[PDB]
Structure formats: structure tokens, C-alpha cells
Design an enzyme around this catalytic site. Sequence first.
Site, short mmCIF file in Angstrom:
data_model
loop_
_atom_site.label_atom_id
_atom_site.label_comp_id
_atom_site.label_asym_id
_atom_site.label_seq_id
_atom_site.Cartn_x
_atom_site.Cartn_y
_atom_site.Cartn_z
N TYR A 150 -8.62 -4.03 6.61
CA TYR A 150 -9.42 -5.19 7.48
C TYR A 150 -9.70 -5.33 8.73
CZ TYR A 150 -7.07 -7.57 3.89
OH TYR A 150 -6.54 -7.85 2.33
N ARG B 133 -7.00 -13.16 -4.05
CA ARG B 133 -7.26 -12.93 -5.34
C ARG B 133 -6.11 -12.35 -6.00
NH1 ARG B 133 -6.56 -7.69 -6.48
NH2 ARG B 133 -6.60 -6.20 -4.21
N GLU C 20 0.15 -7.08 13.97
CA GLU C 20 -1.02 -7.16 12.61
C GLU C 20 -1.93 -7.60 12.70
OE1 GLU C 20 -1.03 -5.91 7.82
OE2 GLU C 20 -0.76 -8.21 8.79
N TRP D 139 2.40 -1.16 7.25
CA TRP D 139 1.18 -0.02 6.76
C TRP D 139 1.35 1.25 6.64
CZ3 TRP D 139 -3.06 -1.92 4.48
CH2 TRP D 139 -3.45 -3.75 4.59
N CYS E 148 -6.15 -7.13 -0.66
CA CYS E 148 -6.02 -9.01 -1.32
C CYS E 148 -6.72 -10.19 -0.60
CB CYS E 148 -4.73 -8.76 -1.19
SG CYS E 148 -3.95 -8.07 -2.49
N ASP F 153 1.96 -12.19 -4.02
CA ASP F 153 3.06 -12.02 -4.49
C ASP F 153 4.05 -13.18 -3.97
OD1 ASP F 153 5.88 -11.12 -3.68
OD2 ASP F 153 5.58 -9.09 -3.90
#
Lengths: 316, 316
Positions: free
Chosen positions: B146, B218, B60, B82, B198, B221
Site C-alpha cells: 500500500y 474484497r 503501519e 509484514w 484486501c 477475516d
Amino acid sequence: MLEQPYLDLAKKVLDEGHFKPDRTHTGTYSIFGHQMRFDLSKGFPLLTTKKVPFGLIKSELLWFLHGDTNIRFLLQHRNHIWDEWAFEKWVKSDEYHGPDMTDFGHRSQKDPEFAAVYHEEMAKFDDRVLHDDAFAAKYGDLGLVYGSQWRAWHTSKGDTIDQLGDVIEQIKTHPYSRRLIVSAWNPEDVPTMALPPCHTLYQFYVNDGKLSLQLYQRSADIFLGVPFNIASYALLTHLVAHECGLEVGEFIHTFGDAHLYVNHLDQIKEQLSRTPRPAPTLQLNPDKHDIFDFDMKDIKLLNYDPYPAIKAPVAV
Amino acid sequence: MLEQPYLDLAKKVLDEGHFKPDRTHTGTYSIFGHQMRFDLSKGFPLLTTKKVPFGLIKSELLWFLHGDTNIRFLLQHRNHIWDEWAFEKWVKSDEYHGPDMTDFGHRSQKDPEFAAVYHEEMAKFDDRVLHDDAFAAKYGDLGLVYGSQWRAWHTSKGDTIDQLGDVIEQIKTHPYSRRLIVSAWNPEDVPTMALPPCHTLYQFYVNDGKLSLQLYQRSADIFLGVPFNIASYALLTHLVAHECGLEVGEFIHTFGDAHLYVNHLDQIKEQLSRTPRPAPTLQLNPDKHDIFDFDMKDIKLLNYDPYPAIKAPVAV
């Protein structure tokens, strides 16, 4: 006491800072990665171990809140914090033909009489922005500065985004958002900017009816800048809770590079032998709740009793 | 031990989290404002108190590093992290006409046989993106993710900014910059995005020849996401030091909202009764130094000996 996180930050940079070079010929001791937390129900974090002029914080923050990028508002409130970025541009124009004044701060610090030469050119530029309307439009407007990245971010389609006004709406409708973020960093602009935003990004969080804010500051001058920085964002946090009818929680201050310039070591050591007073109290106008229309008069600090101001060399 | 900041984060959310509602019908315990620091010279922070699949992190992150936004690369590496954002869009098209599948995750968790219905539609979408070129172009490309905000930020003038490639150049020419910032937050895009980034923003810092990175996240989990988050950015930090010929320093992880979903309390309590092993060791290909052309093969984790994986309900 409430300001203790700031004196622990300054003391930690003294004990553990890396001597680091930087842009300015003045060197720094710095750290990377720091967080501090102030509980705003315990009092307003304006430093009592040194007199900080609140009226400059209060007028500069309303300038931001109004969406304003023009020096004139600040000069009208007798705030000269941003005069150099705009004077700087007056000086490169084919309109300015006075003494040369190049990278003014450097030569005005190890100053000849050039300081009052700089200071009369500046007195002249400042008066011209106050009374000459088209001059103020041309040279008083900074253009890319927090008023406009908070409140009028430019899109690729050519309109503007009032990030602050929309995040205040999202807090009133969706308090539990993990997305209440305002960014002042724009990748497009940041290569040509002179001072890319130091207060890069902030985030609101609501819980149990209390509003907190977190600031990410990419660079911080511990002796001169951070005491203002603290109080400007603790006052943003108070203002958005007023408008949203929430209680205030905490202001969390996160740092990337925090640095102490080498020619501020004596002053910060001396400030560190002072003992915190009981913190001041902010009073916000109870009958006005639209904070974008607030005025100087609408924010009161009660009981601020600080130690003397501490004079220090600005770094250049 | 090196992962201890993660077990102290999880333990602190247990003791002090605010039960907080959110988007998902699963609730959370959360805190706001947290920082953790991992010294990457002491070992790679991949959790040993639970088996974390490094090969998913490694594939990733190269996808991001290549500037890629197309699922096909990930599915080729057997990475399905994803697939739902892209499957989601396949499902609204006037091309998809299969079972209805609306807000798929919810109904596939309290699943009828609908789980293997979801899972065959997905098996079908995934194979079509692998072999059908024009389908992959249409539905495999996520667009705003990203890879593209790191490496191809769009300007208002219509070109693209490779923020990561330019910050790596600024580190090689100006290591002492207090501006080595990559932003994934774009105010323009963020209202229409489904998952606004995130990992909002990160900052590099060099000192005494060591590279550190700070991440501002921000929303996090704690049980499922943060163990991946940690290792993806500690691996970015290693990769940029390789390319720049620097030693690695620290990875500092700053949090806005960090939350534990309520249906992960037993699993995290159990993970918390395990004792950290000695941390793994990253090995990067010593003869390749352009990290954008790196391949899976170029990064090795040596000595990773973790505890068993811990199965947990994904929150919906």
C-alpha cells in the site's frame, strides 16, 4: 416487491439528502454510502414503475462484452447513449467547421433553434460514422471506455489484459476466489478522462452453486441513471452464470455518492405513488454459452409490463 | 454503542454464513456484500470488547503514508505484521541456506521444535534487515504494497503517481468531487502478487464541512483482521481531515467476502458476551498539519479502556 430497494433509495435521498453543489449548474440532494440487494431468482430487476428501454441496455452491454469502443456498433443498433462523447471530439477537430457548438448540452437545453442546429450536426456526425469507415475509425472510437477497460487493459509492457475473460476462467477453475474483481479505474488515465468510470469496480462471488456480483458505483444519478445501471449489471450477472453454468444469486449495488438532481424531484415523487408490478423474466439462449459472441437476439425479457415512461430534464 | 456494527457483523456471519472452503485448510463461514457505518464524531472505533494494539495500526499507517515499502521501518517500531511476506522471499534466495522452511506458517502452526527454528531464522532475518543496509534494500523491500500503490503508482510512461497526495489536493480545491478515489488494485500486477490488496479501493466525500471515507474490502477475516481494518481507515479519515482542516464525518466499511474462520467460533462467541465500553478519543497534533511528515508521537488515543485481548489461532 423486487424493485422496492430502488424506491426506498429514492425516498431516503428525499428525506435525508444533503443539498449539494456539483459540476453541473443543476444542483443535487445526495447521500454517501448506500447498498441495495436484488435476488435475481425472484425476477429481473427492470423497473415496472416506469418504462425503461431494455433494448438500449442489452445493446450497450454487448458492445462492452465484445471489447468494443466504437460508436458505430451502438448507432447501428440505434443506441445513442454514447454519441455525445464522440461528437464532442468531432467538434474540436480541424475537420469540423460548422456552427461553433461549445459545451453543446448547456446551450441545447436552454435551446434556441440551436437545438435543431445541434441535432442536424449530430445527425450528420452519426451518419458519417455509419458509412464512413475512416471517419468512424477517427471519431467514432472513444478509446478509453468500459469495453476496453474490461477487456483490453493496457500494461506498461504494452500488451493488453482481458480482465473479464480471465476472471470468467478463474470462476470456472477457482469459484471460491475472493479475487474475482474487474476494475475500470486506472490512476494513469483518470486525470485526463472526461468521464472517469462511474462503475468503478465489480466483484463476483460463488456459493452453493449460485453466482452473485457486487458493483461499486462512485456516483449515481438516482432518477435517470440507476434504473439502467441496475439492469445492466443484473444482466452481466445472468450472462456470466450462463457461460459458467451456475445459477444466479444476487446483485448487490453499492454506492459512493448517489444523487437526485433538484429538477427531478416532481418526477420521482410521482413515480413513488405507483405500485410495483410482478417483475419481468429473462430468457437467455440455451444453446449458446459463449457470451462474448452473444447477439441481441440471444437475450429475451418476458412479461415486462411497466407503467408509463416519465420524461425528465437531463442535468447540465 | 459505536462498535456495535462490528458485533452485529460477527453475529450475522454466525447466523447466516455459508460454510465455505478457501485457500487455507482452515474453513470459513462467509457472507458476500455488507456495509457498516461509524460516526467518527461520536468517538474513535477501536474495539473496547477486546484489547487491539493501536501502536501497530498507528505505525503501519504512517509506513503507508510515507510511501514506504521497506520492512525496516516497521521492525524499528517493533511491528512484525509484514515480516512474513519479506521473510518468504529471503527463503527462496540463493543466499539463504539454512533449514528448508517451506510454506512456513503451516508447519510452524502444527509445530515441532520447528517453530523456534522458524523463529530463530526469522529473528536472524529481522536483525539483518535492521542493521544490514544492502540486505534491507534487497529483502526488506516488499515492492508492491500500500505505500507504493497509494503514493507511487507506476505509469506505462515509467513515472509515478502519488494518488493520495493528488486526491488531498483535489479535496482542498474541489471538495465536491465525486472522483476522490484511491485504488490499490492494479490488473497488471494482480496475477503475480501473492496477496493482491484486501483494501481494494477507497473514496472520500465532503459535505457540510465534514469528511467521510468509504472503504471497499474484497475479503475480510472478521475476528482477527477487521478490528485493525476499522481503526486504520478511521485514522486515515482523521488524518486527511486534519491536513485539509475539515471536521470528521463517517467511516463507511463495505465488504465483498467477510468471513469467520471456523477455529475462531468460540472466541467470537465469547467476545459477543462482553458489553461495549465508552469509545476512546483520538488526539492529533494541532500544530503539525502535513500528515505525511507525522510521527508516532503526533497521534494520541485518550481513554481507551478495553476488555482483555482474546487469543485466537491465525488461519493457515
